Structure 1
Amino acid sequence: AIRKKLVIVGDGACGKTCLLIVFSKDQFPEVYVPTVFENYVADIEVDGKQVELALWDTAGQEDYDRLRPLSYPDTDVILMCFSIDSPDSLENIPEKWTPEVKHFCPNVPIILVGNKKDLRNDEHTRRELAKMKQEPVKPEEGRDMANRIGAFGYMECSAKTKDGVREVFEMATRAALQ
């Protein structure tokens, strides 16, 4: 079956490793949540199409600007991850990750994924963000950003509750196939 490569980018804040692990395991890790992610090849049937989807993380590579681009070769879809409890991580999407991603991969579909949506109604996050003169990322801001960066689409999910996670990886598969 046709193999497609996926790479996820974004600051450590969003939870790239958590989203990749939750999806590959297809259950929120009960006893132990793994610190690192190696790679994975998930068979997905999306709209009658049998596709092998290779999953890769860019965690740890954040500080190494010469080592990180070695993850990009032949990528068919880029998941551009951000945190709904971290509006600072969203500010890095247009100024840091978009120029780099478009440099190495100019015609690769980018899917702006707003992870940690559950924290929108978590009062410990609303309380902490109030101290920084801030509040959780509104759905209309994540859509405005995806529109500005020229992404294929904007998606939202909760790695903690698995809500939306599967729909992101099926849309990633749709984006890669085109």
Structure 2
Amino acid sequence: VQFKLVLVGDGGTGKTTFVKRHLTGEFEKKYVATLGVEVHPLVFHTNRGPIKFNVWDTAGLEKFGGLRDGYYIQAQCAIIMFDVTSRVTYKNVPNWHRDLVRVCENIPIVLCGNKVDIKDRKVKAKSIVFHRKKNLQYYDISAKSNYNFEKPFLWLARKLIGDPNLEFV
């Protein structure tokens, strides 16, 4: 099963580190501004079989944005990312949602808060109101401590295949 996932969100959030953490199992301490789009196939094993998600990693910085919305075309779903320690990232969330919907309307999107493992948190857990939609659900992911690593991809896989019973192998 093949499904295109567009990974968007503000720059310096750590989404590339998430993708890398899933592909290689290695967390990268250093941050390099992603230019354009980083397309990597990630395959997750399930009881139905193997599900493949083609991840288009989007630039967050405006200057490195590049084609921008052009990556979004034909995306079956999306993951928006923000940093828990930085409020501005969360403030910019409806903007990323807005651009995503324009290109693809009803696609399942997952909101992810990162750096939760970090002691000082700038965003309280109570604030998140994005998951109030049927095609939206929130998660606290930590690319370092690997907390809720598979949760977004799991929820997406279930909502896409149409089987709420689908579990990870």
TM class by shorter-chain length? 0.7 to 0.9
Q: TM-score normalized by structure 2?
A: 0.81
Counterpart of 1:113 in structure 2 is 112
Go from structure 1 to structure 2 and tell me whether the alpha carbon gap of 1:65 and 1:59 turns closer, same or farther (over 3 Å shift). closer
Structure 1 unaligned regions, length at least 5: 127-134
Counterpart of 2:123 in structure 1 is 137
Q: Is 1:71 paired with 2:56?
A: no
Q: Would the aligned equivalents of 1:81 and 1:112 in 2 still touch at CA under 8 Å?
A: yes
What CA distance in whole angstroms lies between the structure 2 residues aligned with 1:170 and 1:46?
Answer: 9
Of 131, 137, 143, the match for 1:146: 131
Write the letter of the residue equivalent to 2:48.
G
Of 139, 148, 151, the match for 1:164: 148
Counterpart of 2:161 in structure 1 is 177
* Greater C-alpha radius of gyration: 1
Shift of 1:51: 1.3
Select the structure with the greater relative contact order (CA < 8 A; seq sep ≥ 6). 1
Per-residue CA deviations over 1:102-143 (Å, capped at 9, x if unaligned) read 111101111111111112x2xxxx4xxxxxxxx62111212x
Per-residue CA deviations over 1:5-62 (Å, capped at 9, x if unaligned) read 1111110132111111111112324xx7573573221221235242111111002663
Q: Percent of pairs identical after alignment?
A: 27
Counterpart of 1:38 in structure 2 is 38
Per-residue CA deviations over 1:138-167 (Å, capped at 9, x if unaligned) read 11212x2332x7752111111122221222
The secondary structure found in structure 2 opposite 1:107 is coil
Q: Say which structure is richer in helix.
A: 1
Q: Which moved more, 1:2-11 or 1:46-55?
A: 46-55
How many corresponding residue pairs?
159
Counterpart of 1:131 in structure 2 is none
Go from structure 1 to structure 2 and tell me whether the alpha carbon gap of 1:152 and 1:47 turns closer, same or farther (over 3 Å shift). farther
What CA distance in whole angstroms lies between the structure 2 residues aligned with 1:60 and 1:89?
Answer: 10
Structure 2 unaligned regions, length at least 5: 163-169
